[PDB]
């Protein structure tokens, strides 16, 4: 069972673990109780192993689709937080914290892909997907081209499906309607076709995946590429002079990343729920709390208003959240596996030439609300 009188954090070991302790070391201070940040490997795999027979951490950190299979089986606790507090965090990211019409965890951080560019290729980086084959056009007679990204994962591709029309699950009355999907309806068809399109008019590879863009990009040979947060300390070290956008429109509309937030829940098993809370959201998400976990491994975007606005100084943060607001909360459902492995599909099909857009989207439909 889950000891009372401390707080067991459980985070992965690519944040900024370090920095909760120093949290942890200010709650000790004003409380008296001890915090412990633990990393386990598995993590997402190891809490509802341990969570289920009432054992584990009293704090989960995870992205947030993790976070609805856990509460389908009451691994979590429903969070408490005034309207005050709520309104301290951004509208879209409590959505992200939400199953079955409860708050399951508090909002930390928000991920986006957005636009990198190369300022000394692009100094003025196009507004729109529509402009960019004459661009590339461009670009190849220099010796270079204008964009490349991976082109494998649903999560790089589908922003620009999404753009005129396409989605994974209707959501309405913080509900996703597993029977209304969006795959093979008119905009996910033209935003397929225009991404399938770049690749016949030689724009772009159908082979292109992530380690091939982000070498391109890092050695200066592509003007453009697409890409998180996470890939930025490796363009810092190649010295290639870039920024980060918004990313482009299609039909005048947004492209529509999925939005990915990282959330900490509180054991439904823990003793401890009160000091969770109060560590939750007096200390950590507070201004000098995120500044603590975010100088020890960046955050990115954060879901604590006040702060974001001090971090969006950085036009790459601003525009991360810029392209997060813009873009599609990724559902917590369990279908969301069957869209993503579909939809994967459906655009190796179409861009191969196996399937036409049509069919690869038809079949990814029919597949997803089987
Ligand atoms: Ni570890
Ligand atoms: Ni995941």
Same mark, same amino acid.
């Given at each position: 069972?889950?000891?009372?009188?401390?707080?067991?954090?459980?985070?992965?070991?690519?944040?900024?673990?370090?920095?909760?302790?120093?949290?942890?070391?200010?709650?000790?201070?004003?409380?008296?109780?001890?915090?412990?940040?633990?990393?386990?490997?598995?993590?997402?795999?190891?809490?509802?192993?341990?969570?289920?027979?009432?054992?584990?951490?009293?704090?989960?950190?995870?992205?947030?689709?993790?976070?609805?299979?856990?509460?389908?089986?009451?691994?979590?606790?429903?969070?408490?937080?005034?309207?005050?507090?709520?309104?301290?965090?951004?509208?879209?990211?409590?959505?992200?914290?939400?199953?079955?019409?409860?708050?399951?965890?508090? +909002?930390?951080?928000?991920?986006?892909?957005?636009?990198?560019?190369?300022?000394?290729?692009?100094?003025?980086?196009?507004?729109?997907?529509?402009?960019?084959?004459?661009?590339?056009?461009?670009?190849?007679?220099?010796?270079?081209?204008?964009?490349?990204?991976?082109?494998?994962?649903?999560?790089?591709?589908?922003?620009?499906?999404?753009?005129?029309?396409?989605?994974?699950?209707?959501?309405?009355?913080?509900?996703?309607?597993?029977?209304?999907?969006?795959?093979?309806?008119?905009?996910?068809?033209?935003?397929?076709?225009?991404?399938?399109?770049?690749?016949?008019?030689?724009?772009?590879?159908?082979?292109?995946?992530?380690?091939?863009?982000?070498?391109?990009?890092?050695?200066?040979?592509?003007?453009?590429?697409?890409?998180?947060?996470?890939?930025?300390?490796?363009?810092?070290?190649?010295?290639?002079?870039?920024?980060?956008?918004?990313?482009?429109?299609?039909?005048?509309?947004?492209?529509?990343?999925?939005?990915?937030?990282?959330?900490?829940?509180?054991?439904?098993?823990? +003793?401890?729920?009160?000091?969770?809370?109060?560590?939750?959201?007096?200390?950590?998400?507070?201004?000098?709390?995120?500044?603590?976990?975010?100088?020890?491994?960046?955050?990115?975007?954060?879901?604590?208003?006040?702060?974001?606005?001090?971090?969006?100084?950085?036009?790459?943060?601003?525009?991360?959240?810029?392209?997060?607001?813009?873009?599609?909360?990724?559902?917590?459902?369990?279908?969301?596996?069957?869209?993503?492995?579909?939809?994967?599909?459906?655009?190796?099909?179409?861009?191969?030439?196996?399937?036409?857009?049509?069919?690869?989207?038809?079949?990814?439909?029919?597949?997803?609300?089987?």
């Amino acid at each position: 069972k889950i000891e009372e009188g401390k707080l067991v954090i459980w985070i992965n070991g690519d944040k900024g673990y370090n920095g909760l302790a120093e949290v942890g070391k200010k709650f000790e201070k004003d409380t008296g109780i001890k915090v412990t940040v633990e990393h386990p490997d598995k993590l997402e795999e190891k809490f509802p192993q341990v969570a289920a027979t009432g054992d584990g951490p009293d704090i989960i950190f995870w992205h947030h689709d993790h976070f609805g299979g856990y509460a389908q089986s009451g691994l979590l606790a429903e969070i408490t937080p005034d309207k005050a507090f709520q309104d301290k965090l951004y509208p879209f990211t409590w959505d992200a914290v939400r199953y079955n019409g409860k708050l399951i965890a508090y +909002p930390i951080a928000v991920m986006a892909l957005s636009l990198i560019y190369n300022k000394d290729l692009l100094p003025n980086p196009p507004k729109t997907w529509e402009e960019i084959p004459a661009l590339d056009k461009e670009l190849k007679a220099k010796g270079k081209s204008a964009l490349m990204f991976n082109l494998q994962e649903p999560e790089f591709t589908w922003p620009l499906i999404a753009a005129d029309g396409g989605y994974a699950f209707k959501y309405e009355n913080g509900k996703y309607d597993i029977k209304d999907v969006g795959v093979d309806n008119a905009g996910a068809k033209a935003g397929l076709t225009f991404l399938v399109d770049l690749i016949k008019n030689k724009h772009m590879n159908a082979d292109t995946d992530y380690s091939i863009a982000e070498a391109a990009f890092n050695k200066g040979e592509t003007a453009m590429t697409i890409n998180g947060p996470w890939a930025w300390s490796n363009i810092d070290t190649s010295k290639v002079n870039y920024g980060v956008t918004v990313l482009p429109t299609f039909k005048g509309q947004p492209s529509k990343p999925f939005v990915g937030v990282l959330s900490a829940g509180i054991n439904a098993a823990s +003793p401890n729920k009160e000091l969770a809370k109060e560590f939750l959201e007096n200390y950590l998400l507070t201004d000098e709390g995120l500044e603590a976990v975010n100088k020890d491994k960046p955050l990115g975007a954060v879901a604590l208003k006040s702060y974001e606005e001090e971090l969006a100084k950085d036009p790459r943060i601003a525009a991360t959240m810029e392209n997060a607001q813009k873009g599609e909360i990724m559902p917590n459902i369990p279908q969301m596996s069957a869209f993503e492995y579909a939809v994967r599909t459906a655009v190796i099909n179409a861009a191969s030439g196996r399937q036409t857009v049509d069919e690869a989207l038809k079949d990814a439909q029919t597949r997803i609300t089987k």
